[PDB]
Ligand binder design. Structure first.
Ligand SMILES: CC(=O)N[C@@H]1[C@@H](O)[C@@H](O)[C@@H](CO)O[C@H]1O
Ligand SMILES: CC(=O)N[C@@H]1[C@@H](O)[C@@H](O)[C@@H](CO)O[C@H]1O
Length: 583
């Protein structure tokens, strides 16, 4: 027929190459369980045969429970998934380019060419004052060349528990933002950086970050701190210069505007100690510091070795000046100096220096680092670092070491996350199954950490809406949101199924934590459910990208995330029911 349609999973992509199998789909009903103030996602997958089909549109009804309580269609947004091209390899110019439905794009009508797949993402926001019950409604697909519209029957159960607000949880989330990348893409000239004209293209995506639980805000403190690994250079938010007396001076202009923005948006709250400023880095690439030398009127650069007299000298100047500046602003207590996975001799020199430099309340800078930890219960150096993030590929699954390490840090009130990056599986690539994201968040809880860190909020390539390929890494690795179109009026970014799955994991671990606290009879049962989590094996495709080790491993990833979720909602249910029977 002209247009086929079926409900599909949000957990994996429906790709053009799978057209003939996709056409056999025939799911006409959907159901899910939600808390008050939760969100659900779904998907409709469609296909054409030999004719193009025009003006394809989806509309939701209102949803109504058994008492007539209403959740308006206002709370349902239906968005076309847009495809972009991705080189399917890693550092491999000859890998093929294939299309991936990675972009949650716009609402409205689509014209679909012949012999194509197209899917639409469905987002359902449950109001924070919604009534419990089973809600029913429908989603209707029409098109010009379609005689009989499709009606898909949707229901969900709202449980009588309230989804926690981010600020009511102890989940740590940190995604690295690249505000000069947003400037580049949207044609913000040098003169307008960190002016209102730049802020208009930042605010939307930062609120997005905030609302899902983002707490870490990165800021660069030297020039090109990652040696231009990304498509866009990384400028320093603190400009360095050397004066005629041979000592250094620091312009905090961009730094201050950046942090203030994040304070204004409610991401950081320095007075109450909410959120973090992560200052990258005291061990930037090759220890290289580029600075304007006033005596010679040109740019110079030096590479002092950590723990040398010269390194100690320069970095004492920076840290004492920075600490004063921060104290004047009232920002010091939420500021962390970031290291990185360097020689342990270099990290020791960093921690030694930092602990030497105190303010007049006897406090030194907090310290943050990605750390290569795999075993052993010697926590003597790790305990000196306030926030650490351990990469997934360094975590040995058949072992309690990570969990033991993290539990120690939890007892000391220190922070711990896991991160993913290039080479990881599960991960958060364009080519990934989006459900890898929910698995990733569950795994952060399995390891008894506070949550999840990723380097990659927005590190866009030239035109990611059309091709995400970059010279390094699996495709889509550097960004979890897309920009909007360069000429956009209105939208400033687009979400991704992979991001929405992280969001899902974050909401569902927050449920598990809420119940563990409010239901002491169930806490240990809940812990055991989480401890049953299995971790899949990984391999590589032919082009160097990390992928599941087998179909069984790939199915595990999806079946595990959903199993824990459903188990948590059953605990939620038994808890509600027993509270009622026993009230
Ligand atoms: C609202 C907010 O950000 N709260 C955090 C809390 O969740 C926890 O992480 C704690 C660390 O000791 O700091 C708090 O101020
Ligand atoms: C904490 C972290 O993400 N570190 C690096 C990051 O800088 C970047 O190189 C990324 C590329 O995927 O790999 C990560 O290992």
């Amino acid at each position: 027929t002209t247009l086929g349609a079926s409900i599909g999973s949000t957990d994996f992509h429906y790709l053009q190459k799978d057209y003939d199998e996709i056409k056999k789909l025939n799911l006409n009903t959907w159901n899910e369980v939600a808390w008050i103030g939760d969100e659900l996602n779904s998907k409709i997958v469609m296909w054409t045969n030999s004719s193009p089909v025009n003006n394809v549109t989806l509309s939701s009804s209102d949803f109504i429970n058994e008492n007539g309580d209403l959740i308006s269609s206002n709370n349902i947004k239906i968005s076309w998934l847009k495809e972009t091209l991705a080189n399917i390899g890693r550092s491999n110019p000859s890998a093929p380019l294939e299309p991936f439905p990675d972009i949650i794009h716009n609402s409205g009508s689509l014209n679909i060419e012949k012999n194509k797949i197209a899917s639409a993402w469905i987002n359902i926001k449950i109001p924070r004052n919604a009534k419990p019950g089973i809600y029913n409604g429908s989603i209707e697909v029409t098109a010009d060349e379609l005689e009989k519209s499709y009606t898909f029957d949707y229901s969900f159960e709202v449980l009588n528990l309230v989804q926690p607000l981010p600020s009511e949880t102890n989940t740590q989330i940190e995604f690295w933002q690249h505000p000069y990348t947003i400037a580049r893409y949207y044609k913000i000239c040098k003169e307008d950086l960190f002016t209102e004209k730049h802020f208009k293209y930042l605010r939307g995506n930062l609120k997005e970050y905030r609302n899902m639980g983002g707490r870490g805000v990165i800021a660069t403190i030297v020039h090109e701190a990652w040696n231009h690994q990304s498509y866009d250079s990384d400028p320093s938010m603190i400009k360095w210069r050397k004066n005629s007396y041979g000592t250094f001076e620091f312009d905090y202009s961009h730094f201050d505007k950046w942090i203030q923005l994040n304070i204004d948006l409610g991401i950081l709250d320095p007075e109450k100690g909410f959120g973090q400023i992560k200052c990258y880095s005291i061990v930037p690439w090759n220890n290289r510091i580029q600075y304007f030398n006033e005596a010679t009127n040109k740019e110079e650069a030096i590479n002092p070795t950590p723990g040398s007299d010269l390194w100690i000298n320069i970095w004492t100047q920076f840290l004492t000046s920075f600490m004063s500046h921060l104290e004047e602003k009232g920002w010091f207590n939420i500021t962390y100096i970031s290291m990185d996975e360097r020689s342990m001799d270099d990290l020791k020199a960093c921690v030694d220096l930092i602990e030497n430099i105190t303010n007049n309340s006897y406090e030194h800078f907090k310290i943050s680092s990605a750390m290569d930890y795999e075993s052993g219960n010697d926590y003597s150096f790790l305990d000196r670092i306030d926030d650490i993030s351990i990469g997934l590929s360094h975590i040995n699954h058949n072992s309690d070491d990570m969990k033991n390490m993290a539990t120690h840090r939890q007892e000391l009130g220190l922070l711990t996350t896991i991160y993913t990056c290039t080479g990881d599986y599960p991960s958060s690539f364009t080519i990934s199954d989006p459900s890898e994201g929910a698995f990733t968040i569950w795994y952060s809880l399995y390891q008894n950490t506070n949550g999840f860190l990723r380097w990659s909020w927005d590190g866009w390539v030239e035109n990611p809406l059309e091709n995400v390929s970059y010279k390094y890494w699996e495709p889509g690795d550097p960004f979890l949101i897309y920009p909007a179109e360069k000429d956009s009026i209105g939208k400033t970014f687009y979400s991704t199924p992979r991001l929405e799955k992280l969001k899902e994991g974050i909401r569902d671990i927050n449920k598990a934590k809420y119940l563990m606290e409010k239901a002491p009879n169930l806490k240990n049962s809940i812990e055991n459910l989480i401890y049953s989590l299995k971790r899949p094996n990984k391999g590589e495709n032919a082009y160097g990208s990390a992928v599941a080790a087998s179909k069984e491993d790939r199915d595990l990833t999806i079946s595990e995330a959903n199993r824990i979720k459903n188990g948590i909602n059953n605990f939620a249910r038994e808890f509600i029911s027993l509270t009622m029977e026993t009230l």
